[PDB]
């Protein structure tokens, strides 16, 4: 399980790997990461599946009443307090690990670690068992100000190397760009997964 | 017996010698007493809601007061009755709604949206220590399946769709002119639905609303959302009452 | 493990019209017989029968619930009880206890009271229904009684076969097992009578 | 213990194993793991052996109630939903692991529901103890958009390979079909293994029986 | 006749007498009046002294629901300190469920659906509060919410409840305050209390202000002595 | 709660006699007549049915007469609706019974049992009493054949032959004289119960669908429970007319 | 006539009667004073005779150290209150370990008595009181009522025939501020007797006070204690 | 919590009030006759509207309890969306022990008995409604009438509502054995045109059947051709 997700100026990009393995072998070897706790945001799923997918449901729920009653999209600041709550009264039984990335009418792109029942605001956010493999790649080749054709190219190099490294991790990457006008969610297939040193 | 009364009948909600229940009788006097009128109409890919606005002083700010609400995305509602009422439901639709998706994961329909909000009013029926709520709800939508759905909730718990509504002070003789319109089958588009819908007030009422004296809400296949049409996006629609 | 503490053992087998069901007579703690007079077959009423296996507390236990639950539900309804549901009772009866089980694996034999309609089946600790065509066995024999069932059990068979059938394979099914013996009680539920017998069995 | 799922154009078809064993022993070698939900929604129990019928029963009474309630057909999201949260509930001591299928008017659609609530939709899957070797036949003939009349034979070529390289799953194959019409149901569609005979009758003269109590109830 | 005994029963003509009654318990409260300007909103109450020996400052009727949220409250002062206590309740789970400052028209909308569901058993009274929430944001603007017995929920440009109410409600009016600055709206609220008061029953009372808006970077506050002292005497030489 | 809506269904009288149960005895007055007479051999119970129409049924069972144990027996004079919580609550009583102590419900263990039910709505909870008044049959290993008539109120005892129900008045001075104590037998008290309902029925005739008969005998140390059918019963009557002449 | 009967039923004045009836409870009873100045806050209490062979009511309770209160009311109705102040105080040093602020005190009180006027079935408590504290805002003088309504005060007078003790506190209100301990406590003293009549006047044995101040916690002077306070007023 | 005490009471007369007038809102409502004969059971109610805007799709009397059973009414109409609900449940709760469809003896018995606890609870009236249950079990139809008081009978054939005395007589005249399901649809139809005025369309009359094919509502197209007065 690798999550990412990475911060520029009109959005954010939340890229993800697919494949889902108990044990060292693979549940779905097609899965999606990225389940919308509303329009313009997006939650990475990490950890239990049985977990995440439990919390990231009660997060999507209890975030709809909040838009419903505001009568107006809930910021990202909200869907990550919500996804706090409920990681961290639960943190003995659930083992489960969101990330929440998104945009806003305020603040614009956001990105928030949930890890464990804290709270962060990121430029950019790594998760799942793969990520630490890439944390050389994301400390040198990040640079402040990247355009949205960069950042997804950056959040692409990035995981790619971490389904090589990863044994639990693996699959085609997704890729949500949150903007202003909508969600671009693109899907990049094994053959447009950039090459890195083979041997 | 014909209005018979025998001990306790009146005051709390139990059968009458003549089995009637008086005291939802009268939960149909708290809707006239909100001193207003709405009317919603069905057309063929549209359901139009239009709701008589009233700001009486300068001081009320126009954007703070609505009958129009938003239930979920795709719903749409317009609550005629008590104020107080109105908004206790609303706020429980809303619950029920999101619960709805949050159990059966998909949203709600219109016509089950209007059941769970009846068999509730039917507890505060039966129960003796409550009264029931004042507030009669009317909800439209548009249902993948069936199309454009507009339905009505009283506070007996009796909910029924209707092709053409009416609520509040006037209704019997606002409804008078729906058979006159509705029996001659019109073809309905969206325009041809909001002129005629805002003519069934203007009949009435003998008025011919200005922009700031309306709201409508509006659905269609086209917008499954549910929309609020501007001040000038109504006064668009009121040039064509100068012509037919 | 635990239900094999006191022992014993049950069979149920289906014939044609007819059914028979069986069980030892031996009530023991571990190594250490007591009495030879236990009970492990109850009546249900006319032309049914349960049996019960396992740990002997909940044998006792478990049957005084039955007969609670069933004249509840005979008196209720105007018809006797059919085999098929009270399959489904006794279920929901263990079922209930998943998370303390009662421990026993009920075998229930018997007639549908509509004509002559034979059922069988056989239950576990969580109570998951079993219905076969053939024969249900339980207890902590059960590994010979299976091997014993299968050879000798036929599709169809008169009343007379079936006690032949299920008596010798009740008595050799027995004589491998340490802790059942001490006799065998078998009954043959027909669609006319019922026909109970005890079978001479070696004392050890 | 194996069963499996598969989407084609149409619609889905759910397949299973009939032989269920408790340690080791055939308890009974005919038994039905599909069971019924709604009339176009059907599912696999696999798992603890009542843990994935008493399930089934709860999910399929919940949606006869909203079926009736609502006057609409049931929605294949709807049941994933009941069993998800009725198997998170007990925080994974229930072990049933259900693969939930059927047509609604959204299109095909196939769930899968992990024993702790862990569900995935996809085009194909396979649960219990043999899910190894029918999801490996399943990656490798696989391909979207399937005729019916050749779905068939990739199923039960899937079980198949399940039921002969696995010792916990035997007997005969069950499959389900499901479109647009729906409830299309197909018992003991495939049998592995035909020679069942068993000749040398035992079968003896009655008469030897050292019986001492016998007694008559006339009735 | 028995129809008004409890708030569980409608009178034959519909309405809810023990709801209305609750009403009439905030038309012999003293006055309060709420209004918003470019900048921010701006309270105003009279605070009546019944006696000499009460300390300056006591029986407070501006709470302060959160750091970014007012209160006014007119009627019977005992349920007041109940429903800040409450409102406070909501603006704290607010702050722990979503972390963030509550906005206005959710926070009069949970304490208008509290005080609502007292109107409806019979074990239960109505509230005889009414009570106005102004507040303000850089990404919302001058907000104000007034709650009445009933738990209905408007907004405003300026507003009067309690005794005075048609009387204060048209002189607002004549004012126009959409393009004013708060700095300049301080002096015109003590301008509009000390016209509407007037002295025939009641004898003296303690003019309260408070700010909010652009001037306190959203923070509520009191307005401070200078500034009260500067707004306080230019309604007095306004008087004539 | 609102006491303005109470009625106060436990407190006493000004005479000390609770009026919701007064009011029970007044509906049990004008509802089925029901009799029994306890013989050397056998109890029987005789209900009249107050719904007779052509358009019923007559699905069930004696319509009236239940069953609360394989021993025993019970009829009912008083509302139809409240008689069914009694007898499923008679029915977990035995079983409770015979759940510890693994054997047959004696007949004074079950009436007092359930006499504890109706006094705890009689006595607090402030719901409305039961309108139902029972008569009860039995048989038990220590005092033989039992006739139990309980009532609103909890009240019972031990009775040779009793009635209730309406004209239960005049009923009763008949079985006073007619019945003779040890020299009953069941087909002497079958002709008694008759010539006791003939002059109390409000219809004349005696037709076989009203009065039906349910018998308890004991035979092979088994309690036999039978509900006489309409031929046995227009038979019994026939041979009762033929005496009033001939 | 049918309004009276119920804590939740409102009138067509918009009146609870019973609440009204409850601020009766505290006109039936003694009255009781009490004042502060920058320093000192000083409770003084008429502890009424049921007759001359019986002993008097305690009107002063302790409540914590810097904390203490004059009931005037039902007697074994103000020891709920009492109850719940002492546990209110004592759980303010076992958590903060701090003295618990008396505006703090009294808006919990505000909570208690709210809920039975709020509640049906439920009687309001008819106890007055008054709450004499020390804190690092100064000393407090609080009045409470049956309505949970309550006040912030330089000086009060509640119980039966009252409004004469607050009178006399009005004149006086401008030296109260620099009074000693002894002038001040003087102050209530004088206040006691305008509510009784000239038929009685004060003694060691009907008289209780209490004082709390800067450096001095809450301490109750009870018989002996009150005579050199006594002696030197001249009546 | 609410009101622990009992709104039912003994009168001096011995006769429950409450119940009295429950079975007085019942004979104002919508006309509804039934009929078992041979092998199913007819239930034809007349839902009578006030105009043309009116949804007939939206709402429906006779309702399905399961598929073995269903269920029309005559009196309060909201009253009767809490029995069906109630009823579904209990149909559900049987099939979930005894694992066969509840027969209808078995679910009268239950259903009655919850109309029995609202005579006794506290704070509750008893429902207004008088239902009409029909079921088809063991090749047996059944046709059960439950009402307020929780007294459940078995009628071969009955009518409610507006002129229920009036029904019931046309239905001895009528009424017999060897009658088709077929007649029975005819003569339920014929007593609602002595009950009902003006003219009976698709729209007006609601009909459901009950037989071996389990039960199910009459669409009206189904239902205009029985109004052709053939069948």
Same mark, same amino acid.
């Given at each position: 399980?690798?999550?990412?997700?990475?911060?520029?100026?009109?959005?954010?990009?939340?890229?993800?790997?697919?494949?889902?393995?108990?044990?060292?072998?693979?549940?779905?070897?097609?899965?999606?990461?990225?389940?919308?706790?509303?329009?313009?945001?997006?939650?990475?799923?990490?950890? !239990?599946?049985?977990?995440?997918?439990?919390?990231?449901?009660?997060?999507?729920?209890?975030?709809?009443?909040?838009?419903?009653?505001?009568?107006?999209?809930?910021?990202?600041?909200?869907?990550?307090?919500?996804?706090?709550?409920?990681?961290?009264?639960?943190?003995?039984?659930?083992?489960?690990?969101?990330?929440?990335?998104?945009?806003?009418?305020?603040?614009?792109?956001?990105?928030?670690?949930?890890?464990?029942?804290?709270?962060?605001?990121?430029?950019?956010?790594?998760?799942?068992?793969?990520?630490?493999?890439?944390?050389?790649?994301?400390?040198?080749?990040?640079?402040?100000?990247?355009?949205?054709?960069?950042?997804?190219?950056?959040?692409?190099?990035?995981?790619?190397?971490?389904?090589?490294?990863?044994?639990? !991790?693996?699959?085609?990457?997704?890729?949500?760009?949150?903007?202003?006008?909508?969600?671009?969610?693109?899907?990049?297939?094994?053959?447009?997964?950039?090459?890195?040193?083979?041997? | 017996?014909?209005?018979?009364?025998?001990?306790?009948?009146?005051?709390?909600?139990?059968?009458?010698?003549?089995?009637?229940?008086?005291?939802?009788?009268?939960?149909?006097?708290?809707?006239?007493?909100?001193?207003?009128?709405?009317?919603?109409?069905?057309?063929?890919?549209?359901?139009?809601?239009?709701?008589?606005?009233?700001?009486?002083?300068?001081?009320?700010?126009?954007?703070?007061?609505?009958?129009?609400?938003?239930?979920?995305?795709?719903?749409?509602?317009?609550?005629?009755?008590?104020?107080?009422?109105?908004?206790?439901?609303?706020?429980?639709?809303?619950?029920?709604?999101?619960?709805?998706?949050?159990?059966?994961?998909?949203?709600?329909?219109?016509?089950?949206?209007?059941?769970?909000?009846?068999?509730?009013?039917?507890?505060?029926?039966?129960?003796?220590?409550?009264?029931?709520?004042?507030?009669?709800?009317?909800?439209?939508?548009?249902?993948?399946?069936?199309?454009?759905?507009?339905?009505?909730?009283?506070?007996?718990?009796?909910?029924?769709?209707?092709?053409?509504?009416?609520?509040?002070?006037?209704?019997?003789?606002?409804?008078?002119?729906?058979?006159?319109?509705?029996?001659?089958?019109?073809?309905?588009?969206?325009?041809?639905?909001?002129?005629?819908?805002?003519?069934?007030?203007?009949?009435?009422?003998?008025?011919?609303?200005?922009?700031?004296?309306?709201?409508?809400?509006?659905?269609?296949?086209?917008?499954?959302?549910?929309?609020?049409?501007?001040?000038?996006?109504?006064?668009?629609?009121?040039?064509?009452?100068?012509?037919? | 493990?635990?239900?094999?503490?006191?022992?014993?053992?049950?069979?149920?087998?289906?014939?044609?019209?007819?059914?028979?069901?069986?069980?030892?007579?031996?009530?023991?703690?571990?190594?250490?017989?007591?009495?030879?007079?236990?009970?492990?077959?109850?009546?249900?009423?006319?032309?049914?029968?349960?049996?019960?296996?396992?740990?002997?507390?909940?044998?006792?236990?478990?049957?005084?619930?039955?007969?609670?639950?069933?004249?509840?539900?005979?008196?209720?309804?105007?018809?006797?009880?059919?085999?098929?549901?009270?399959?489904?009772?006794?279920?929901?009866?263990?079922?209930?206890?998943?998370?303390?089980?009662?421990?026993?694996?009920?075998?229930?034999?018997?007639?549908?009271?509509?004509?002559?309609?034979?059922?069988?089946?056989?239950?576990?600790?969580?109570?998951?229904?079993?219905?076969?065509?053939?024969?249900?066995?339980?207890?902590?024999?059960?590994?010979?009684?299976?091997?014993?069932?299968?050879?000798?059990?036929?599709?169809?068979?008169?009343?007379?076969?079936?006690?032949?059938?299920?008596?010798?394979?009740?008595?050799?099914?027995?004589?491998?097992?340490?802790?059942?013996?001490?006799?065998?009680?078998?009954?043959?539920?027909?669609?006319?009578?019922?026909?109970?017998?005890?079978?001479?069995?070696?004392?050890? | 213990?194996?069963?499996?799922?598969?989407?084609?154009?149409?619609?889905?078809?759910?397949?299973?194993?009939?032989?269920?064993?408790?340690?080791?022993?055939?308890?009974?070698?005919?038994?039905?793991?599909?069971?019924?939900?709604?009339?176009?929604?059907?599912?696999?129990?696999?798992?603890?052996?009542?843990?994935?019928?008493?399930?089934?029963?709860?999910?399929?009474?919940?949606?006869?109630?909203?079926?009736?309630?609502?006057?609409?057909?049931?929605?294949?999201?709807?049941?994933?939903?009941?069993?998800?949260?009725?198997?998170?509930?007990?925080?994974?001591?229930?072990?049933?692991?259900?693969?939930?299928?059927?047509?609604?008017?959204?299109?095909?659609?196939?769930?899968?529901?992990?024993?702790?609530?862990?569900?995935?939709?996809?085009?194909?899957?396979?649960?219990?103890?043999?899910?190894?070797?029918?999801?490996?036949?399943?990656?490798?003939?696989?391909?979207?958009?399937?005729?019916?009349?050749?779905?068939?034979?990739?199923?039960?070529?899937?079980?198949?390979?399940?039921?002969?390289?696995?010792?916990?799953?035997?007997?005969?194959?069950?499959?389900?079909?499901?479109?647009?019409?729906?409830?299309?149901?197909?018992?003991?569609?495939?049998?592995?293994?035909?020679?069942?005979?068993?000749?040398?009758?035992?079968?003896?003269?009655?008469?030897?029986?050292?019986?001492?109590?016998?007694?008559?109830?006339?009735? | 006749?028995?129809?008004?005994?409890?708030?569980?029963?409608?009178? &034959?003509?519909?309405?809810?007498?023990?709801?209305?009654?609750?009403?009439?318990?905030?038309?012999?409260?003293?006055?309060?009046?709420?209004?918003?300007?470019?900048?921010?909103?701006?309270?105003?109450?009279?605070?009546?002294?019944?006696?000499?020996?009460?300390?300056?400052?006591?029986?407070? +009727?501006?709470?302060?629901?959160?750091?970014?949220?007012?209160?006014?409250?007119?009627?019977?002062?005992?349920?007041?300190?109940?429903?800040?206590?409450?409102?406070?309740?909501?603006?704290?789970?607010? +702050?722990?469920?979503?972390?963030?400052?509550? &906005?206005?028209?959710?926070?009069?909308?949970?304490?208008?659906?509290?005080?609502?569901?007292?109107?409806?058993?019979?074990?239960?009274? &109505?509230?005889?509060?009414?009570?106005?929430?102004?507040?303000?944001?850089?990404?919302?603007?001058?907000?104000?919410?007034?709650?009445?017995?009933?738990?209905?929920?408007?907004?405003?440009?300026?507003?009067?409840?309690?005794?005075?109410?048609?009387?204060?409600?048209?002189?607002?009016?004549?004012?126009?305050?959409?393009?004013?600055?708060?700095?300049?709206?301080?002096?015109?609220?003590?301008?509009?209390?000390?016209?509407?008061?007037?002295?025939?029953?009641?004898?003296?009372?303690?003019?309260?202000?408070?700010?909010?808006?652009?001037?306190?970077?959203?923070?509520?506050?009191?307005? &401070?002595?200078?500034?009260?002292?500067?707004?306080?005497?230019?309604?007095?030489?306004?008087?004539? | 709660?609102?006491?303005?809506?109470?009625?106060?269904?436990?407190?006493?009288?000004?005479?000390?006699?609770?009026?919701?149960?007064?009011?029970?005895?007044?509906?049990?007055?004008?509802?089925?007549? #029901?009799?029994?007479?306890?013989?050397?051999?056998?109890?029987?119970?005789?209900?009249?049915?107050?719904?007779?129409?052509?358009?019923?049924?007559?699905?069930?069972?004696?319509?009236?007469?239940?069953?609360?144990?394989?021993?025993?027996? #019970?009829?009912?004079?008083?509302?139809?609706?409240?008689?069914?919580?009694?007898?499923?609550?008679?029915?977990?009583?035995?079983?409770?019974?015979?759940?510890?102590?693994?054997?047959?419900?004696? #007949?004074?263990?079950?009436?007092?049992?359930?006499?504890?039910?109706?006094?705890?709505?009689?006595?607090?909870?402030?719901?409305?009493?039961?309108?139902?008044?029972?008569?009860?049959?039995?048989?038990?290993?220590?005092?033989?054949?039992?006739?139990?008539?309980?009532?609103?109120?909890?009240?019972?005892?031990?009775?040779?032959?009793? #009635?209730?129900?309406?004209?239960?008045?005049?009923?009763?001075?008949?079985?006073?004289?007619?019945?003779?104590?040890?020299?009953?037998?069941?087909?002497?008290?079958?002709?008694?119960?008759?010539?006791?309902?003939?002059?109390?029925?409000?219809?004349?005739?005696?037709?076989?669908?009203?009065?039906?008969?349910?018998?308890?005998?004991?035979?092979?140390?088994?309690?036999?429970?039978?509900?006489?059918?309409?031929?046995?019963?227009?038979?019994?009557?026939?041979?009762?007319?033929?005496?009033?002449?001939? | 006539?049918?309004?009276?009967?119920?804590?939740?039923?409102?009138?067509?004045?918009?009146?609870?009667?019973?609440?009204?009836?409850?601020?009766?409870?505290?006109?039936?009873?003694?009255?009781?004073?009490?004042?502060?100045?920058?320093?000192?806050?000083?409770?003084?209490?008429?502890?009424?005779?049921?007759?001359?062979?019986?002993?008097?009511?305690?009107?002063?309770?302790?409540?914590?150290?810097? =904390?203490?209160?004059? =009931?005037?009311?039902?007697?074994?109705?103000?020891?709920?209150?009492?109850?719940?102040?002492?546990?209110?105080?004592?759980?303010?040093?076992?958590?903060?370990?701090?003295?618990?602020?008396?505006?703090?005190?009294?808006?919990?009180?505000?909570?208690?008595?709210?809920?039975?006027?709020?509640?049906?079935?439920?009687?309001?408590?008819?106890?007055?009181?008054?709450?004499?504290?020390?804190?690092?805002?100064?000393?407090?003088?609080?009045?409470?009522?049956?309505?949970?309504?309550?006040?912030?005060?330089?000086?009060?007078?509640?119980?039966?025939?009252?409004?004469?003790?607050?009178?006399?506190?009005?004149?006086?209100?401008?030296?109260?501020?620099?009074?000693?301990?002894?002038?001040?406590?003087?102050?209530?003293?004088?206040?006691?007797?305008?509510?009784?009549?000239?038929?009685?006047?004060?003694?060691?044995?009907?008289?209780?006070?209490?004082?709390?101040?800067?450096?001095?916690?809450?301490?109750?002077?009870?018989?002996?204690?009150?005579?050199?306070?006594?002696?030197?007023?001249?009546? | 919590?609410?009101?622990?005490?009992?709104?039912?009471?003994?009168?001096?007369?011995?006769?429950?009030?409450?119940?009295?007038?429950?079975?007085? $809102?019942?004979?104002?409502?919508?006309?509804?006759?039934?009929?078992? $004969?041979?092998?199913?059971?007819?239930?034809?109610?007349?839902?009578?509207?006030?105009?043309?805007?009116?949804?007939?799709?939206?709402?429906?009397?006779?309702?399905?309890?399961?598929?073995?059973?269903?269920?029309?009414?005559?009196?309060?109409?909201?009253?009767?969306?809490?029995?069906?609900?109630?009823?579904?449940?209990?149909?559900?709760?049987?099939?979930?022990?005894?694992?066969?469809?509840?027969?209808?003896?078995?679910?009268?018995?239950?259903?009655?008995?919850?109309?029995?606890?609202?005579?006794?609870?506290?704070?509750?009236?008893?429902?207004?409604?008088?239902?009409?249950?029909?079921?088809?079990?063991?090749?047996?139809?059944?046709?059960?009438?439950?009402?307020?008081?929780?007294?459940?009978?078995?009628?071969?054939?009955?009518?409610?509502? @507006?002129?229920?005395?009036?029904? @019931?007589?046309?239905?001895?005249?009528?009424?017999?054995?060897?009658?088709?399901?077929?007649?029975?649809?005819?003569?339920?139809?014929?007593?609602? @045109?002595?009950?009902?005025?003006?003219?009976?369309?698709?729209?007006?009359?609601?009909?459901?059947?009950?037989?071996?094919?389990?039960?199910?509502?009459?669409?009206?197209?189904?239902?205009?051709?029985?109004?052709?007065?053939?069948?």
């Amino acid at each position: 399980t690798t999550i990412m997700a990475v911060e520029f100026d009109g959005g954010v990009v939340v890229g993800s790997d697919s494949r889902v393995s108990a044990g060292e072998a693979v549940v779905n070897r097609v899965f999606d990461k990225l389940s919308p706790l509303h329009q313009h945001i997006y939650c990475a799923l990490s950890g !239990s599946a049985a977990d995440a997918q439990a919390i990231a449901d009660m997060a999507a729920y209890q975030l709809e009443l909040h838009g419903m009653e505001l009568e107006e999209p809930p910021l990202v600041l909200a869907a990550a307090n919500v996804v706090r709550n409920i990681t961290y009264k639960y943190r003995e039984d659930l083992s489960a690990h969101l990330m929440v990335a998104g945009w806003d009418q305020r603040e614009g792109g956001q990105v928030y670690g949930t890890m464990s029942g804290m709270l962060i605001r990121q430029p950019f956010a790594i998760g799942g068992s793969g990520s630490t493999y890439i944390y050389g790649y994301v400390d040198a080749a990040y640079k402040p100000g990247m355009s949205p054709e960069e950042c997804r190219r950056f959040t692409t190099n990035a995981i790619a190397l971490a389904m090589k490294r990863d044994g639990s !991790s693996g699959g085609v990457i997704y890729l949500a760009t949150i903007t202003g006008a909508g969600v671009d969610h693109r899907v990049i297939l094994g053959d447009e997964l950039p090459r890195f040193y083979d041997e | 017996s014909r209005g018979s009364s025998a001990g306790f009948d009146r005051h709390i909600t139990i059968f009458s010698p003549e089995g009637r229940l008086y005291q939802v009788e009268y939960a149909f006097k708290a809707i006239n007493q909100g001193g207003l009128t709405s009317v919603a109409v069905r057309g063929k890919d549209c359901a139009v809601i239009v709701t008589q606005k009233k700001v009486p002083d300068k001081l009320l700010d126009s954007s703070t007061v609505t009958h129009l609400f938003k239930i979920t995305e795709n719903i749409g509602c317009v609550m005629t009755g008590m104020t107080a009422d109105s908004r206790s439901q609303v706020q429980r639709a809303r619950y029920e709604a999101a619960n709805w998706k949050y159990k059966y994961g998909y949203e709600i329909p219109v016509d089950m949206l209007c059941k769970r909000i009846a068999d509730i009013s039917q507890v505060y029926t039966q129960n003796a220590e409550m009264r029931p709520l004042g507030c009669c709800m009317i909800l439209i939508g548009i249902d993948e399946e069936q199309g454009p759905q507009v339905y009505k909730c009283d506070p007996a718990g009796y909910y029924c769709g209707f092709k053409a509504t009416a609520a509040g002070v006037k209704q019997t003789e606002s409804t008078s002119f729906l058979e006159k319109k509705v029996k001659k089958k019109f073809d309905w588009t969206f325009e041809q639905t909001v002129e005629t819908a805002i003519t069934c007030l203007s009949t009435v009422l003998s008025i011919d609303f200005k922009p700031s004296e309306i709201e409508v809400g509006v659905v269609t296949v086209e917008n499954p959302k549910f929309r609020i049409l501007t001040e000038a996006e109504i006064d668009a629609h009121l040039v064509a009452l100068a012509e037919r | 493990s635990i239900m094999s503490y006191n022992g014993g053992a049950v069979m149920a087998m289906k014939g044609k019209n007819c059914v028979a069901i069986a069980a030892d007579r031996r009530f023991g703690i571990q190594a250490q017989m007591v009495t030879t007079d236990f009970q492990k077959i109850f009546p249900m009423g006319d032309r049914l029968y349960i049996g019960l296996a396992g740990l002997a507390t909940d044998v006792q236990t478990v049957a005084q619930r039955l007969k609670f639950r069933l004249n509840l539900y005979e008196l209720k309804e105007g018809r006797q009880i059919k085999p098929y549901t009270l399959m489904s009772m006794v279920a929901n009866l263990l079922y209930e206890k998943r998370f303390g089980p009662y421990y026993t694996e009920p075998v229930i034999a018997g007639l549908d009271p509509k004509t002559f309609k034979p059922f069988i089946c056989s239950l576990d600790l969580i109570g998951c229904p079993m219905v076969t065509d053939d024969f249900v066995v339980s207890g902590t024999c059960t590994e010979q009684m299976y091997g014993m069932c299968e050879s000798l059990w036929e599709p169809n068979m008169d009343p007379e076969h079936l006690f032949e059938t299920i008596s010798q394979a009740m008595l050799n099914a027995v004589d491998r097992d340490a802790v059942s013996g001490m006799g065998v009680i078998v009954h043959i539920i027909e669609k006319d009578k019922i026909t109970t017998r005890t079978l001479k069995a070696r004392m050890d | 213990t194996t069963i499996a799922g598969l989407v084609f154009q149409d619609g889905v078809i759910l397949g299973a194993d009939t032989r269920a064993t408790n340690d080791s022993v055939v308890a009974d070698k005919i038994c039905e793991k599909i069971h019924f939900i709604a009339p176009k929604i059907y599912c696999c129990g696999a798992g603890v052996a009542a843990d994935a019928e008493m399930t089934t029963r709860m999910a399929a009474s919940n949606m006869e109630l909203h079926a009736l309630s609502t006057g609409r057909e049931c929605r294949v999201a709807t049941v994933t939903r009941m069993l998800r949260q009725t198997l998170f509930r007990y925080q994974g001591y229930v072990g049933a692991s259900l693969i939930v299928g059927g047509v609604d008017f959204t299109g095909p659609q196939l769930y899968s529901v992990h024993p702790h609530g862990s569900y995935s939709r996809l085009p194909f899957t396979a649960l219990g103890s043999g899910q190894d070797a029918a999801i490996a036949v399943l990656e490798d003939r696989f391909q979207p958009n399937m005729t019916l009349e050749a779905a068939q034979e990739l199923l039960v070529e899937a079980i198949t390979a399940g039921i002969l390289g696995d010792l916990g799953s035997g007997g005969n194959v069950d499959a389900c079909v499901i479109t647009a019409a729906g409830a299309k149901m197909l018992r003991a569609l495939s049998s592995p293994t035909k020679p069942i005979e068993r000749s040398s009758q035992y079968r003896f003269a009655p008469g030897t029986t050292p019986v001492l109590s016998q007694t008559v109830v006339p009735l | 006749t028995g129809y008004d005994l409890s708030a569980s029963t409608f009178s &034959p003509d519909g309405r809810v007498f023990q709801v209305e009654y609750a009403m009439k318990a905030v038309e012999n409260s003293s006055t309060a009046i709420g209004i918003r300007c470019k900048d921010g909103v701006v309270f105003g109450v009279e605070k009546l002294v019944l006696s000499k020996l009460y300390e300056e400052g006591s029986n407070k +009727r501006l709470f302060n629901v959160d750091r970014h949220v007012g209160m006014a409250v007119a009627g019977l002062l005992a349920d007041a300190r109940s429903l800040a206590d409450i409102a406070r309740e909501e603006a704290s789970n607010f +702050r722990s469920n979503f972390g963030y400052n509550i &906005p206005l028209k959710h926070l009069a909308d949970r304490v208008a659906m509290y005080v609502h569901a007292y109107t409806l058993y019979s074990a239960v009274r &109505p509230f005889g509060c009414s009570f106005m929430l102004g507040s303000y944001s850089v990404n919302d603007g001058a907000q104000l919410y007034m709650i009445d017995p009933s738990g209905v929920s408007y907004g405003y440009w300026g507003c009067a409840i309690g005794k005075a109410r048609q009387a204060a409600k048209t002189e607002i009016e004549k004012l126009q305050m959409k393009e004013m600055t708060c700095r300049d709206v301080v002096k015109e609220v003590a301008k509009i209390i000390y016209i509407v008061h007037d002295e025939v029953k009641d004898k003296a009372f303690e003019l309260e202000l408070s700010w909010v808006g652009e001037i306190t970077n959203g923070r509520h506050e009191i307005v &401070p002595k200078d500034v009260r002292e500067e707004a306080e005497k230019y309604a007095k030489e306004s008087l004539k | 709660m609102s006491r303005r809506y109470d009625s106060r269904t436990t407190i006493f009288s000004p005479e000390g006699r609770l009026y919701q149960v007064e009011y029970a005895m007044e509906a049990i007055g004008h509802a089925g007549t #029901c009799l029994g007479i306890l013989a050397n051999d056998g109890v029987l119970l005789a209900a009249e049915r107050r719904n007779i129409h052509k358009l019923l049924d007559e699905v069930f069972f004696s319509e009236k007469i239940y069953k609360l144990n394989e021993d025993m027996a #019970c009829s009912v004079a008083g509302i139809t609706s409240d008689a069914n919580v009694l007898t499923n609550e008679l029915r977990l009583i035995a079983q409770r019974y015979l759940l510890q102590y693994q054997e047959p419900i004696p #007949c004074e263990q079950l009436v007092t049992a359930l006499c504890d039910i109706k006094q705890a709505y009689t006595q607090f909870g402030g719901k409305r009493p039961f309108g139902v008044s029972l008569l009860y049959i039995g048989w038990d290993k220590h005092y033989g054949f039992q006739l139990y008539q309980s009532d609103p109120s909890g009240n019972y005892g031990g009775w040779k032959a009793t #009635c209730i129900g309406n004209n239960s008045a005049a009923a009763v001075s008949m079985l006073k004289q007619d019945y003779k104590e040890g020299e009953m037998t069941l087909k002497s008290a079958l002709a008694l119960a008759i010539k006791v309902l003939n002059k109390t029925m409000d219809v004349s005739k005696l037709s076989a669908e009203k009065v039906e008969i349910a018998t308890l005998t004991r035979e092979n140390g088994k309690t036999v429970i039978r509900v006489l059918k309409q031929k046995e019963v227009e038979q019994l009557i026939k041979k009762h007319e033929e005496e009033e002449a001939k | 006539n049918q309004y009276d009967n119920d804590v939740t039923v409102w009138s067509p004045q918009g009146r609870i009667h019973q609440i009204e009836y409850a601020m009766e409870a505290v006109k039936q009873g003694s009255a009781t004073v009490g004042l502060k100045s920058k320093t000192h806050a000083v409770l003084v209490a008429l502890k009424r005779a049921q007759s001359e062979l019986a002993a008097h009511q305690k009107k002063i309770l302790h409540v914590d150290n810097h =904390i203490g209160i004059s =009931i005037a009311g039902l007697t074994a109705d103000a020891r709920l209150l009492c109850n719940f102040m002492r546990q209110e105080c004592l759980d303010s040093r076992f958590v903060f370990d701090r003295p618990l602020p008396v505006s703090r005190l009294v808006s919990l009180i505000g909570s208690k008595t709210q809920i039975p006027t709020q509640r049906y079935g439920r009687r309001p408590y008819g106890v007055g009181l008054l709450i004499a504290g020390y804190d690092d805002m100064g000393p407090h003088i609080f009045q409470t009522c049956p309505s949970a309504n309550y006040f912030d005060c330089r000086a009060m007078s509640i119980g039966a025939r009252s409004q004469s003790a607050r009178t006399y506190l009005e004149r006086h209100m401008s030296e109260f501020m620099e009074c000693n301990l002894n002038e001040l406590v003087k102050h209530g003293l004088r206040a006691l007797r305008e509510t009784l009549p000239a038929e009685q006047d004060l003694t060691t044995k009907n008289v209780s006070i209490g004082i709390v101040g800067k450096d001095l916690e809450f301490t109750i002077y009870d018989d002996d204690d009150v005579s050199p306070f006594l002696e030197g007023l001249e009546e | 919590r609410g009101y622990s005490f009992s709104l039912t009471t003994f009168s001096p007369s011995g006769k429950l009030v409450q119940i009295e007038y429950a079975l007085a $809102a019942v004979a104002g409502g919508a006309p509804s006759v039934g009929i078992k $004969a041979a092998n199913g059971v007819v239930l034809a109610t007349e839902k009578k509207q006030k105009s043309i805007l009116y949804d007939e799709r939206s709402v429906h009397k006779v309702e399905p309890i399961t598929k073995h059973i269903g269920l029309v009414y005559s009196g309060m109409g909201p009253d009767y969306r809490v029995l069906v609900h109630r009823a579904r449940k209990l149909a559900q709760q049987y099939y979930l022990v005894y694992q066969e469809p509840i027969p209808t003896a078995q679910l009268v018995q239950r259903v009655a008995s919850v109309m029995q606890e609202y005579t006794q609870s506290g704070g509750v009236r008893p429902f207004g409604v008088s239902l009409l249950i029909c079921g088809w079990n063991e090749g047996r139809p059944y046709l059960f009438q439950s009402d307020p008081s929780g007294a459940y009978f078995a009628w071969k054939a009955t009518a409610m509502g @507006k002129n229920y005395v009036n029904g @019931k007589t046309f239905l001895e005249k009528r009424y017999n054995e060897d009658l088709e399901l077929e007649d029975a649809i005819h003569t339920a139809i014929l007593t609602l @045109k002595e009950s009902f005025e003006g003219q009976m369309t698709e729209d007006n009359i609601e009909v459901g059947i009950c037989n071996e094919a389990g039960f199910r509502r009459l669409t009206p197209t189904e239902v205009k051709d029985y109004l052709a007065a053939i069948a």
